[PDB]
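Supplementary material to the annual report.
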Amino acid sequence: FGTNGFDIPTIAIALLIVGVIIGLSGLILSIFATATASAISNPSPGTLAYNLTHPLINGMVSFFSFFPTLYVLLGVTGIVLIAAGIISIIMEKF
Amino acid sequence: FGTNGFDIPTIAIALLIVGVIIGLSGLILSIFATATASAISNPSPGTLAYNLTHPLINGMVSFFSFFPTLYVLLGVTGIVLIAAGIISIIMEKF
Amino acid sequence: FGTNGFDIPTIAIALLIVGVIIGLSGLILSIFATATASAISNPSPGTLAYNLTHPLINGMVSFFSFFPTLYVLLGVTGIVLIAAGIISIIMEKF
Amino acid sequence: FGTNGFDIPTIAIALLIVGVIIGLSGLILSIFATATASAISNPSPGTLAYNLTHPLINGMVSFFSFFPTLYVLLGVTGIVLIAAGIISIIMEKF
Amino acid sequence: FGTNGFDIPTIAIALLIVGVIIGLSGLILSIFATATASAISNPSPGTLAYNLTHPLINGMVSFFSFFPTLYVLLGVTGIVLIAAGIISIIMEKF
Amino acid sequence: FGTNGFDIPTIAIALLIVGVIIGLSGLILSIFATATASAISNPSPGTLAYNLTHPLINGMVSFFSFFPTLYVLLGVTGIVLIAAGIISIIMEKF
Amino acid sequence: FGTNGFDIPTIAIALLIVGVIIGLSGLILSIFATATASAISNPSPGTLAYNLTHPLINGMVSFFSFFPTLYVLLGVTGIVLIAAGIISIIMEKF
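Predicted assembly:
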């Protein structure tokens, strides 16, 4: 059901695959992050361990705050792909 | 029943296939998402685990909100295909 | 019973085939959709699972609402085919 | 009584076989589950054995709740098979 | 009594065979289902055994409710076969 | 009763096997966990044995709390398998 | 009186044999069980011998309660055998 490489069943299957993969990734990351939160303690505000450990958790927080826009762009890509497919169909179907 | 590659039985079969595939995808994704919702907990509003986990679920929500327009465009494609078929029939049937 | 490729028995058989195929497709899709409706539940209006699942069912609804016009155009195609047959007969029968 | 591989007696025999197998499976599973229910006890709500045992029975309940939709899809498959048989007969019987 | 492969005695014999096979299948399934009904008990509405056993009987009920339409389609197939035979006779008997 | 490797009797038998295996596993684990609960005692809240033993039972509790989602995913896998079977049948049965 | 291996006299003789064997088994088991009931006594509800002996008689009761469905299935088998014989006769007698 298509012209050259655009196949609606294939597109649906690809959407399925990316959806389940993203769900799994969120699941695994949340489960692991719970263990991370449990493991690390809060020694004190001003002793050696605080100086030793605080920037690491800061980097954790920053990277994980970067994740959302990555996911948003990844979502945007699919609309572009389906659009190029529609345009390609229209170009030489007539 | 056609001219070159436009076959009404083939079109009906393709519509059947895409329909059942989309139904399956929705089914599997909903079943998996229920498990995802069950697995992840809500630690607290302001502790380490919240900072560690919140953006992930935000990305989940965003991507899944992108799904609907993908499905809509995928639906639009079929009208274009059947239209090109009709036009191609009319062009050289007379 | 025809001139070159227009055969009234063949047309009748093709109409039979497309009719039964469309009936089957409707049957199978309805039977599957009943199972889909049974499987998915309604968690709550505002919790995580709702955010995770609602757009999927929205896409389901949209695509299935696109089906009717596809069927209508598919029906329209046959009148065009029989018309081209009639015109072709008249052109060189005299 | 058929064309290539579609045989109504064979289909009837296959329906018989799947029916009796499913009946047996239900019988054996129920008989075993009764013994499971008898064996496991309820120690107390909050002691060590409860923490040790509760998630296991939760997993039991979840999987067994997944069974019904599996059976429903398995039932749906047969209509598809008989339908493909009918279509195949019609295609080249005429 | 026929042309190529359509034989009225053969058709009558095939109808006989499918009829007796279907009667046997119904007989055996009913006899077995009576034993199934006798074997399984009703423990209680809310204890462990109920959670363990209820979905199994639900799947039983669903599949057995799917049987009727299977039988109906199986019956429909024979009219198609005899029809193709009649058409084939008429095509080249004259 | 199938096309290449999808066999409804085989699927039913596989469902039977996985069901009984899971029931057995739950049974054996619960029976063993009862013995574990009986064996270990509660020395005191703050003496040497408490420091020596508490994290072990904590790990016990955590792993056994991980079991349920494992079972849920294991259940989800079967719907995917039966779905791929249905799709494969539909693809080349017509 | 048959075709290949189906012999009505042989079937009647087999029915005779299974009937008398089952009658004998019931007779011997009842006679032995009477002696078992006579031999074992009822020491007391709560002393050592009760703890030592009660589960044994519980297992006795359970197994003997399992017997009936075994007999029922054994009875069901014969209808299947005679049915396969009838079908085999019909298949190639014509």
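Chain F is about 85% helix and 0% strand.
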